[PDB]
Write a protein that binds this ligand. Structure first.
Ligand SMILES: CCCCCCCC/C=C\CCCCCCCC(=O)OC[C@H](COP(=O)(O)OCC[N+](C)(C)C)OC(=O)CCCCCCC/C=C\CCCCCCCC
Ligand code: NA
Ligand code: NA
Lengths: 401, 592, 401, 592
């Protein structure tokens, strides 16, 4: 009848070279999202098509001097193609020269951080089953029950409870140990037994909350939005050195993306990578201190690669669309536009996206280990620090003995 | 030229009537997203426009018989409108008759759930790993061990009084073992079993609290449609007429086919008929309902007071709102170039932040908190306050300063002790018990059956309000036969108490010998320990049959104790006190 | 062309009367498995059918005196029907007079027990975090460390450790309490500290295993097979008073079903119910002490009703089949036989069974409570029994003082 | 009449050749289910038969081009056979060309998994809630607290020796607090922090053991295809050619469509090509592979030695094996009546129990077991045996029976102590570390990189076997910079030890004054406590970077310590012993 020269670009999962492409020939050399999409457009619009990768290898832009269009846009304007079933972003400068359909895929700028791991434990990590409000109120109560036991014994007599001895009865009461002497007045018996019931609940609450932490691994991200990235300075963030994503933050005006751009423009060292593969490798080799601002479709795809190291957080920052382009004044413009809206409402576009991102995507969708010395290392430090601060006070003691 | 007739629909925050709607006139009667969007398009395309609200109040659909469009799509096809700057979904059946621009807003089907919003701990929530019958019977065990300590020691070859025996049982309970040790083998049996008792109780407290804190960390909130698909404790529903309901019936996606399966067969009806109804059902369900709606409404209602609902997960499909034109218009091409310019100049994100978020009525650690354990501080502050109270009266006792009041308190506690157990075992109020069904609206209860209970006499109440006091000897369950096993121990308790009373009386009538006072002291203690065996049997019989109920989500039981149960608890404290009083003056007869 | 009079019986989920059957009329009065099956047979074999419930209301049997066939078999033999798309069991006596197809549903005799619940706690239920082998070895070791501490102190002297005192040091060491006096020889210091490390592990093992039990509810059934039912006598089991299931155990000869029949024949009271609804209600109102031996298709269906009270355990005891019956010498015999094998291999028969048993089936496919007094009641009993056995030995003591 | 030609296939346990196959001849060459079934059918139908094995060795299928059946279905259509008494599946394409009887065996697709078979606890598995570096550093903390107890007390205004100081730290560690109390405020700081130390350690032991026992109760075995569908840690596969593989590709059932999705895209290939291969992959995977096969093979292989695999769940579909006839035979109707008679007389269940189970090579509590805690009994029996050992030498010491050997042991421990730490910090064996990949077959390892390590000198090894001893000052990670932070504390430990040594020497050269012996005693204890800060920093630096690894299922790390790490541990025990020795003879100089 006539052959239709379609044009796409080499980009996963849209068009990939199949494993046996040196022995296959025709439209069977290539596989991917746009290969399956071109098959669906052809069966609805009724044409025979020839898959053809763009020679220039770009998407399409107009030179500011020669006014000549590069990429897949250039093959439609000048005549080398009949349709571009490809991830072309529907933009203002391209709609003036070629005709887009409705967006078969909606996307935007997203955040790629490294997938969060357990943590490194600090020194006072052993205190974390109880909040700092609790630990300070225990110290306040330990001074509290010792001052009262001093006033219970010295005033209203029955002795052997000084300000140093009342701290020493209540201390072994806390860690459930044995003391030298017991109170013998009923006022002192209340100070004993009620503080005994206090530390019984606190030790049990410490052990039970630590058992919940060691059983259920509940990892969180520091970043859940670009509002979170703007407020912080610990995690660095950047875009690619040339493209629509860096140009988005350059001319943005809202509240946050201006704040994010003044960060990225100023920051030393350079947050701007030069390749997408450089920005993904910089996320993995930064131990969770670099976030790469890129498109949501690549962000969901790289998250389904190996290793399982990157993560998409938050929502999109803008709203773009990928359209199927035809030359202006073409006989394919209207039926392909009606074909995209038919495939969208039937679930075909959702089905092909679940296939090439999740079904054909690796890393789809324990056995508690021993506690390392890192988790309880601060308890050794207070212990030896307690042994060091006891040899000093004994040396302070024989300065006046 | 002429004025372009802009047809829109009344929908918030797209087109809203202003507050001064009656006084102010023209195109200035209206505010919203699409009113600001119509000004941006007319500025770039270069026309003067008039805003009109569609008469039908619909978006647009063709009749299956009449084939006439009824809405904003109808006014474009039939010539009444020149443009529809409106939240109009770009649809296959609509694109055949009108021309859409590129989407000015990308959107889809989302999930609306109620925020968990918290679980608030009370004052004595630290007691919650054990039931209140355990904490009651621990105190009965604490008094019971101490008086047996006093009995076994100061009659034997003292250091142990009841002041020291209450002190040994404290340090053993909170695992201190502070210092005092029973020396005879008979005293060591008391210390032995009370050491094993508190070893189980502290282990049961820690392990049940570890169970509670672990299960609430297993609670995963809904973050996808797969989460709604699996979890069936949250019911989810759609509006009864619209594109969101029609999405699930035709979907050939595995998770979405299962969700329509759940919704088409669910009792009662999960399909609301109004968006305001579906938002209301989210709020009056305490996180047990999830409403599937449009994402732009889900983001807008989340920013309205009350700040109660939230948007979870992503979108379930991808569709867009477009600017629509008569399909033969000379305006459709500059409008299409206008929307793509406003998308790239950030005007559309600026206007969405304005109406959804800037005019939003809302805003925008895993450790144990201090509110979880604030009550054990309150006992501790309360303990130090009570200790300063005794410090006055003990300093007063030494500064200011026999068997007579000791004789008197032994009798008068045994008088009230024999009386309170007697009127408790006779009267029938030992167990309240309600039954019924949970009505869906407001969880309003209806008691299908109340009860009264004694030991050999139950009586029914308001639910079937009959005065028919059924004897347990013959009528008509098994839990009334389980308390028959519990029944003899308060009877033996009253029997040991009476013999201890009459020997306490003739010890006061005839104080000639001494030994009959100690025989009284044995009998009050054995009567109290028989009450502990009785009350633990009585409560354990109830909790076993509360478990054997075939638990349902439409039944409820509200078992309760009464003043007949309470006077038996008072009967314990008085006879164990009169047991301390009886061994006291028996030592005075040896002394004097 | 001609109308086909099909015959079925009123039985869920096979043919049920639809909710609006008084206003609907035709083949739309009825719904169910066999209603959807008759629609699938008609679209493959090409006929128009009339749904007709059997007047007699039975499945079909031959009278031993009149030799006349009842039920749906009788309407095919004498002429009142053209096909019986129904759950008819393919048997020897029916195949001689009518023609069955291949089995569209395979089934057998199964076991219906009540769905297991938590338990009722006994008296020594508090001991259950540790096995009885552990508890006896602790008592052996407590006597062991007390006899050794006696020989450590009396032989090889340094006293205050008799046979009663050495039991008393090791006792408070077990429950982590304070004792009156400590050992003062290095041999006694080893007996102290090593038994101290013993009870530290045992108390921690008790608390941790109890925390695992209270967190993960893992309920089990006493019965997992008919081999389990034969060996026990606690749970009673029976069949219906008349039918194929009772006749199966009557003439069985293998090993176990003869043992099960001698049980059921002898047992008092009667294990044989007279209705299926009586046997299901007897399972629910027996608190897990009655098992009802019935067909696997009703057992899976009643399990998906309300309440969620019954459970199917084990596998099938025999192997039966439900076939679609035609009269002998019929023009529908061969195409319906080829229709059943076509619907089986396409998944239609599996799809209709998932619909009417699981998708149209209710009861498809936490928040830890406080411990009741029932769980720890035996600890109170040993305590008061310890208080009772101490007042007695003190009374034994003053018989020789 | 003629002899009926029975065509069967060689398949166990349906038709098997006997052991005496060479000598015995006729129809008696064969045994099995279908040999017994052919005898039962010929007895009821009344014919004499001859058993033949099919030449092709196939069941039967038509070619897509040639349209010729190749198997037992082929010998029936083409006249070579009169009946096929065989495990022949009743199929739609087969029923068109031959006549099947009713199914003599009902069957389907099942799941074959490996039995868990146990997890066996070792001797010292009770130590496993804490790492062995914790249990090592507890003993270092136990020695460290005791020697500081002795230092702080017997130099001050004794009850405390090192014999009593090791005893106070025992009762505090196992939470007894048996009886002795430090009286001065300086001694109470030692008792204070060691009470808080063991409060965290016992709580960490109990909570981690509660985590372990809870997670292993969360382990649910596979009991359905829905369990295989959800859980992706067990890989499941089919045979590469057969009806079971063709079942999943055409299935429109939601759980079965997802299983084919997992199997069509999985690396490496889950599809085996032989049934014997698929059973083998179940056995060499330790419960990480599940083979989807025929139910009758799954029940038969389960009864074969080794008793290693099991059948879980129910069947995934419903099909049957039938007796097949030429479609124009006068034998098909009595055979159909024969199979229904043998089904009801229990003959078919008798023959299945015979070959599957009666000739089967196999057979056919939730509490903590005594094997989990047997090691703490072994310490306890070991403790009582060690206590009787000291009972001899303490009875010997009293029966038989100064500063000189006390002077000698103080020196010679400080000589070896200064030497062992010196040669440890200099040499580079502090950390072995292996890296590599896990080969699939036999889990055979290959070390891609070994390491040596010191404090300022690492050296590579066999994986890229280079002798290039990289200095840490400049080369080329961060964990080598983390041990740089650890580095000064063994250097200060050696610095405190040398000053303590030379003051110990001139105290022996010049015993004129006394005070320089105690200054020696301070320096050995502070050197040992600096080693505790050093070794805890050194180990915690390693375990933090072991966590930051981006954990994969194809990588493995096998970090290990060496004799350079071990001599620093020995350097602790000797200087803390020489610290006890130094304060001992300083008290002898006061005494004498
Ligand atoms: C070291 C401690 C010694 C005992 C070690 C174990 C701790 C007690 C737990 C125990 O042993 O299980 C409870 C015992 C029964 O023993 P069983 O382990 O075989 O349970 C199986 C019994 N079945 C088969 C009926 C279920 O029931 C009981 O009443 C014994 C409970 C013991 C209560 C504390 C000791 C009593 C006081 C003794 C006086 C001091 C001694 C002289 C100084
Ligand atoms: Na203690
Ligand atoms: Na837990």
């Amino acid at each position: 009848q006539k052959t239709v020269v379609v044009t796409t670009i080499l980009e996963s999962p849209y068009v990939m070279m199949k494993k046996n492409h040196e022995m296959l020939e025709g439209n069977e050399r290539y596989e991917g999202y746009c290969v399956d999409l071109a098959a669906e457009i052809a069966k609805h619009c009724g044409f025979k098509y020839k898959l053809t990768i763009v020679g220039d290898g770009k998407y399409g832009a107009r030179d500011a001097d020669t006014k000549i269009w590069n990429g897949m846009v250039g093959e439609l304007v000048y005549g080398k193609a009949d349709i571009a079933i490809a991830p072309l972003t529907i933009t203002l400068v391209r709609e003036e020269v070629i005709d887009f359909s409705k967006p078969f895929m909606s996307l935007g700028i997203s955040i790629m951080i490294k997938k969060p791991q357990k943590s490194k434990p600090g020194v006072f990590s052993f205190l974390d089953p109880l909040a700092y409000e609790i630990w300070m109120c225990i110290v306040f109560a330990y001074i509290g029950v010792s001052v009262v036991l001093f006033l219970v014994s010295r005033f209203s007599p029955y002795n052997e409870f000084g300000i140093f001895n009342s701290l020493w009865f209540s201390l072994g009461a806390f860690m459930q140990q044995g003391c030298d002497i017991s109170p013998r007045s009923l006022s002192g018996r209340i100070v004993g037994g009620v503080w005994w019931f206090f530390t019984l609940i606190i030790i049990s609450s410490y052990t039970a909350n630590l058992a919940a932490f060691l059983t259920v691994e509940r990892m969180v991200s520091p970043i859940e939005s670009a509002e979170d990235l703007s407020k912080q300075t610990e995690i660095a963030y950047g875009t690619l050195d040339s493209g629509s994503t860096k140009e988005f933050f350059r001319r943005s005006k809202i509240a946050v993306f201006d704040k994010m751009w003044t960060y990225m423009r100023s920051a030393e060292p350079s947050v701007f990578v030069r390749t997408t593969a450089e920005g993904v490798a910089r996320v993995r080799k930064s131990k969770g201190k670099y976030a790469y601002l890129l498109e949501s479709t690549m962000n969901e795809y790289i998250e389904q690669r190996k290793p399982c190291d990157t993560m998409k957080v938050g929502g999109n920052l803008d709203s773009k669309g990928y359209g199927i382009a035809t030359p202006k004044g073409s006989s394919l413009g209207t039926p392909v536009n009606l074909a995209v809206l038919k495939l969208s409402e039937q679930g075909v576009l959702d089905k092909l996206k679940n296939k090439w991102w999740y079904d054909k995507g690796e890393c789809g969708a324990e056995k508690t280990s021993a506690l390392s010395l890192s988790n309880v290392a601060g308890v050794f430090y207070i212990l030896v620090g307690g042994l060091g601060l006891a040899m000093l006070v004994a040396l302070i003691e024989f300065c006046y003995k």
